[PDB]
Every structure is written in structure tokens, then in C-alpha cells.
Amino acid sequence: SIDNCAVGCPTGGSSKVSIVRHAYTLNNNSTTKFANWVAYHITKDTPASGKTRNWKTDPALNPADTLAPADYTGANAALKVDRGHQAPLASLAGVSDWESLNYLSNITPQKSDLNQGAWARLEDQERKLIDRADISSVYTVTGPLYERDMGKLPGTQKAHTIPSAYWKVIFINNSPAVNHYAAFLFDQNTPKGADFCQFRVTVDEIEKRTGLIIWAGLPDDVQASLKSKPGVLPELMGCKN
Amino acid sequence: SIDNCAVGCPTGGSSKVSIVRHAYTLNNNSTTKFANWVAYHITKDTPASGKTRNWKTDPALNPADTLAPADYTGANAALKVDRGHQAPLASLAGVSDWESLNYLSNITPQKSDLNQGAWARLEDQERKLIDRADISSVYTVTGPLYERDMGKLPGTQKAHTIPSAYWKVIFINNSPAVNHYAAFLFDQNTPKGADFCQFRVTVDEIEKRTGLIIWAGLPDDVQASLKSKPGVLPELMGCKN
Numbered sequence: 325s326i327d328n329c330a331v332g333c334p335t336g337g338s339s340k341v342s343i344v345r346h347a348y349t350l351n352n353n354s355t356t357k358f359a360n361w362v363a364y365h366i367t368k369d370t371p372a373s374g375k376t377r378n379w380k381t382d383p384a385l386n387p388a389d390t391l392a393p394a395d396y397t398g399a400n401a402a403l404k405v406d407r408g409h410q411a412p413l414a415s416l417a418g419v420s421d422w423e424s425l426n427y428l429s430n431i432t433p434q435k436s437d438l439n440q441g442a443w444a445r446l447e448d449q450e451r452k453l454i455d456r457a458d459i460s461s462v463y464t465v466t467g468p469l470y471e472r473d474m475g476k477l478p479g480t481q482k483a484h485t486i487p488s489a490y491w492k493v494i495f496i497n498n499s500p501a502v503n504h505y506a507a508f509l510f511d512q513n514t515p516k517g518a519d520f521c522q523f524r525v526t527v528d529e530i531e532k533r534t535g536l537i538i539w540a541g542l543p544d545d546v547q548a549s550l551k552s553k554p555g556v557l558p559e560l561m562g563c564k565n
Numbered sequence: 566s567i568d569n570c571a572v573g574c575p576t577g578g579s580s581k582v583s584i585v586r587h588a589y590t591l592n593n594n595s596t597t598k599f600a601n602w603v604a605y606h607i608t609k610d611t612p613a614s615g616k617t618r619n620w621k622t623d624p625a626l627n628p629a630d631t632l633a634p635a636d637y638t639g640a641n642a643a644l645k646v647d648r649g650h651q652a653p654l655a656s657l658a659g660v661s662d663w664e665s666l667n668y669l670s671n672i673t674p675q676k677s678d679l680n681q682g683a684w685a686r687l688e689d690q691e692r693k694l695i696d697r698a699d700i701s702s703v704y705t706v707t708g709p710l711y712e713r714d715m716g717k718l719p720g721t722q723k724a725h726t727i728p729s730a731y732w733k734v735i736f737i738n739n740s741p742a743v744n745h746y747a748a749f750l751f752d753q754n755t756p757k758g759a760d761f762c763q764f765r766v767t768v769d770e771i772e773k774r775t776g777l778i779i780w781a782g783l784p785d786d787v788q789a790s791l792k793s794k795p796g797v798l799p800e801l802m803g804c805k806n
């Protein structure tokens with residue numbers, strides 16, 4: 325009874341069932357150990373600052389199909405990665421199941437310079453959209469890409485696949501059929517000082533690279549036309565051209 | 566009490582007072598003899614087909630400040646122009662004062678190849694938007710450019726200025742601050758078989774070439790960012806890239 329997608333959650337996830345929470349809807353990958361996609365819905369009631377971060381194994385998954393906190397030991401030192409959120413904590417932690425934002429189904433080993441740099445700056449602008457009086461929702465889908473060998477977490481024996489990049493698809497209010505939208509894609513090795521505005525892409529590129537269909541409930545004609553056209557939502561997020 | 570603009574009618578027109586009708590809001594130019602801009606609001610209830618075209622002098626204007634039917638005598642033979650509508654007849658002819666769509670304040674001498682070609686095909690797609698279940702309004706502003714000498718109507722003694730080009734700025738539903746938008750600009754000499762999708766521009770370009778501020782009630786930051794960025798509404802009208 326919770327719809328975190330509005331226009332249909334993505335198809336093409338490796339799991340036929342998705343986890344549905346107030347914080348987000350997520351589709352796990354038991355092979356990579358990370359979520360294929362995470363969909364969430366920011367409203368005026370969802371942001372909450374200063375929450376704590378008790379990393380925890382997601383109790384709704386089989387423990388063999390996801391990571392545990394122990395699996396991150398030594399990762400920062402060896403790989404210069406953080407425990408990076410997919411659905412962002414500060415944008416969503418006002419919901420009733422907020423601690424699930426720190427479940428490791430919502431985390432990947434994300435390069436620190438990306439997590440703390442352009443990815444964070446994009447999160448900040450994404451969240452700020454909800455402060456506009458005429459913006460009542462931000463609906464986002466985010467996830468990883470696996471396109472090159474990224475090495476392995478040193479602290480685990482579990483088979484897993486570290487992402488090589490991350491993507492984020494955003495629209496406001498009711499539907500990208502009528503409302504502004506955006507899509508971004510960042511390599512893991514994006515420089516710390518990068519401008520997130522330089523990473524705009526089409527939804528079609530993300531779909532072709534991921535094997536997903538985003539906004540899967542839209543009419544075919546809407547999908548074809550809008551997914552090959554970069555959106556204008558980034559212009560409201562401080563981007564030029 | 567009638568709001569044909571939603572987000573503020575344009576500023577900068579030569580007349581300090583505009584004519585407000587159910588069919589449109591119009592700002593006349595007593596020097597050129599044509600409207601500086603015409604703003605209108607298509608809904609599911611506004612289109613009507615097959616209405617006739619009884620051209621008439623606008624009774625709300627001083628006759629010296631506008632054209633009369635006699636003024637068009639011989640114009641097609643001299644200049645290959647038609648009596649071209651600014652606010653489109655078929656999209657608006659169901660309104661309560663529809664005959665005002667054929668008042669000459671809503672008409673200019675528009676090259677036949679443009680009127681019957683790309684301009685008409687844009688009108689058709691603009692009108693078709695309202696058939697979509699999720700589109701409840703189309704708000705448009707249209708008007709001329711005055712940049713080169715296009716000749717004089719042979720049938721009048723009045724000083725007048727034939728337009729050199731025509732533009733159309735469109736958005737759907739509530740506001741371009743949140744909804745898709747488009748802008749188009751066509752020279753008078755546009756070839757008959759031209760594809761209207763090849764004439765997309767920014768709102769900023771139209772403003773700079775007219776002295777107007779369109780959507781003048783939007784916040785400054787919304788104006789600055791969106792007006793320099795071509796919109797995505799044309800993708801819903803059959804256009805690509």
C-alpha cells in the first residue's frame with residue numbers, strides 16, 4: 325500500500341519481489357549483494373537532519389544474499405570507499421521506518437570522493453527542491469552499474485561485485501509525462517570537486533547500461549519520447565544549459 | 566477575472582491596457598496595427614471544428630489603431646500573404662466569444678506558405694496535446710517579430726508594419742515552473758513543407774527579439790533558469806532531440 329514510484333517501479337531487477345518500506349522500495353541482487361535499484365519519494369514530511377548511522381544487515385533478506393557490517397572492515401583503508409547510501413538518509417529519515425535507511429541493502433562501497441563530493445551536492449539540490457511551494461514531491465530512482473572490475477572488499481569472503489558507477493533519475497510532483505525530470509550518471513572515480521551538472525544523461529542511456537526499464541508504467545509513446553531527451557529539472561537545481 | 570496566462574501575462578507591450586476575452590488576452594500596437602502578443606488557454610472544452618471566418622474590425626479598439634477587412638484587398642496578389650490567426654480558431658472556437666477569433670486584432674498578413682504549412686502543423690500538435698488524459702490545459706503566448714521590411718498592404722493608406730516572423734511559447738497544465746514547455750520561432754519565408762520541429766528556440770531569444778517579458782509573474786530565479794533552456798514539450802508533439 326506504499327507507492328514510492330508513482331509511474332510504476334522499474335522492471336528488469338534480478339529479484340522478482342521488491343522490499344517496500346516508507347523509506348524506499350528496493351530490489352535486491354543476491355549475486356552482487358547490492359540493490360539493483362532503490363526508489364524513493366521525498367515530501368515536506370520526509371527530511372530529517374542529524375540522524376545516527378547504525379549500519380545493520382537487512383532483516384528482510386536472507387543474510388547470504390546481502391552484506392553485514394563486518395563485511396566493510398578495512399574497506400576505507402584499502403579501497404578509499406565509504407558506506408554510501410542509495411536512498412539518502414537526510415532526505416527521508418522523517419519516515420516511520422527510517423532506520424532501514426542504514427540497512428546494508430541500501431548501502432554500497434562508494435568511493436569517498438564521490439560520496440562526499442558531487443553525489444552529496446546532487447543530494448542536497450534534490451532535497452532542496454521540496455522547499456519550493458509548488459513542488460509537493462520528488463520521486464527518484466537510483467542504483468549502481470557494473471561495467472569494470474573494481475576489486476573486492478577485503479573484510480569478507482562473500483562473493484560480491486563492487487559498483488563501477490551510479491545513476492539517479494528524478495522527477496517532481498506527479499509524473500515525468502507532464503513534470504520536469506532529470507537523469508545523472510557518475511563513475512566511481514569522479515573527482516571530489518566535480519560539478520554534478522556535468523554528469524547529466526538521458527534515461528535511455530541508464531536503461532541500456534543497467535538492463536532496467538525505469539518509470540515502467542508510463543505509456544509507450546511517453547517513454548519513447550522523453551527517455552531519449554535530457555530533462556530540464558537540473559536548471560532548477562543550479563545548473564546552466 | 567478571466568486568466569488566459571496563469572503565470573502572469575507578458576509585460577513590455579506597447580499598450581498599457583490589454584483586451585481580455587474568453588478567447589484570448591491581447592495587447593494591441595496602434596503603430597504596427599497588429600497585436601504585440603496574444604495569450605490563450607486551451608482546455609478540453611475550447612476546441613470546435615468547422616467554424617466560419619467572418620473577418621471584422623475589433624470593436625474594442627479605435628478603428629484608426631487596427632485594420633479593417635477592406636485593408637486586406639489585394640494583399641494575397643501583392644505579397645502572397647493570408648489573413649493568419651494569432652490565437653488559433655479551431656482550438657478555441659468553443660468559447661463564449663469565439664467570433665472574436667476572427668477580429669483583425671487577432672490577424673496579421675502571414676505568408677501563405679507559413680500559415681498553411683509549419684504554422685498549421687504546430688497548431689495541430691498544440692491542439693492535440695489537450696486530448697491527453699493527463700493534460701488539462703495548454704497555455705500559449707504567440708506574437709510577431711518586426712525585424713525587416715516585409716512590404717505594405719496595397720489596400721490601405723494606414724501606416725502599418727507587417728511582421729517578419731512569428732513565435733509561440735507553450736506550457737501545459739499549471740506552470741512552466743513545474744510543467745513541460747516549448748518555444749518556436751518561424752521566419753515569414755519558412756518553406757511550405759518545413760518541419761515545425763526544426764524551429765525550436767528559447768523563451769529568452771523571443772524576449773530579446775520582442776522587448777517583452779513572457780510569464781512575467783514567475784519568480785526571478787525560475788525565469789532566469791528556464792527561459793535560457795529549450796523545453797521538452799516538443800517531444801510530446803512528435804519532435805525528436
Ligand SMILES: [Mg+2]
Binds near residue numbers: 408440
Ligand atoms: Mg552518501
Ligand SMILES: [Mg+2]
Binds near residue numbers: 685
Ligand atoms: Mg492560420
